[PDB]
Amino acid sequence: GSTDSNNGYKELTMDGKHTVPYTISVDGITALHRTYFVFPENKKVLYQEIDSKVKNELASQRGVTTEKINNAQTATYTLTLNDGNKKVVNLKKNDDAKNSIDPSTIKQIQIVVK
């Protein structure tokens, strides 16, 4: 078991773009069409501003609307920064819906509703 210590080899994985894998859980089940997202750097945005556009994307694949999510028993997602930090917040209660953040610090996120 030996890995590169200095150099390795050339790579072309969305070089220049910020990729961020997204996950979701339903009743304990894991998504099957999981994928990654891309966004610009050095830019701030409102959590509610983005989520508003994301909800329309997840509602089309999950079929869950603002009325359905309300019927859910629980809704929480964990956020993972690029530094390796972790913060789980309930979707039902947007505490950052009135805050500004950038994807440049976002590494990955996993939603959990049931």
Side-chain angles (χ1 to χ4, degrees), residues 51 53-64 69 111:
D51 162 83
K53 98 201 288 283
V54 173
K55 52 132 290 100
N56 161 265
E57 312 229 37
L58 86 89
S60 18
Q61 55 167 95
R62 303 221 260 288
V64 60
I69 47 131
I111 306 172

Side-chain angles (χ1 to χ4, degrees), residues 2 23 29 33 43 45 52 59 65 87 100-101 104 110-111:
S2 173
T23 34
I29 205 168
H33 282 168
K43 297 173 74 100
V45 281
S52 164
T65 72
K87 251 300 206 214
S100 72
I101 80 302
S104 187
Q110 58 191 68
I111 306 172

Side-chain angles (χ1 to χ4, degrees), residues 59-97:
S60 18
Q61 55 167 95
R62 303 221 260 288
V64 60
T65 72
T66 54
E67 159 144 56
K68 189 70 72 159
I69 47 131
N70 210 248
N71 269 246
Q73 315 226 33
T74 193
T76 332
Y77 79 88
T78 304
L79 161 140
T80 317
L81 252 51
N82 270 232
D83 286 71
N85 274 272
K86 71 95 212 165
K87 251 300 206 214
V88 193
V89 284
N90 233 73
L91 255 150
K92 227 104 76 84
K93 315 94 157 295
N94 323 99
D95 310 306
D96 246 31

Side-chain angles (χ1 to χ4, degrees), residues 22-38:
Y22 100 90
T23 34
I24 188 267
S25 149
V26 169
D27 284 42
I29 205 168
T30 323
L32 59 153
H33 282 168
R34 308 184 228 80
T35 192
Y36 333 124
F37 274 58
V38 180

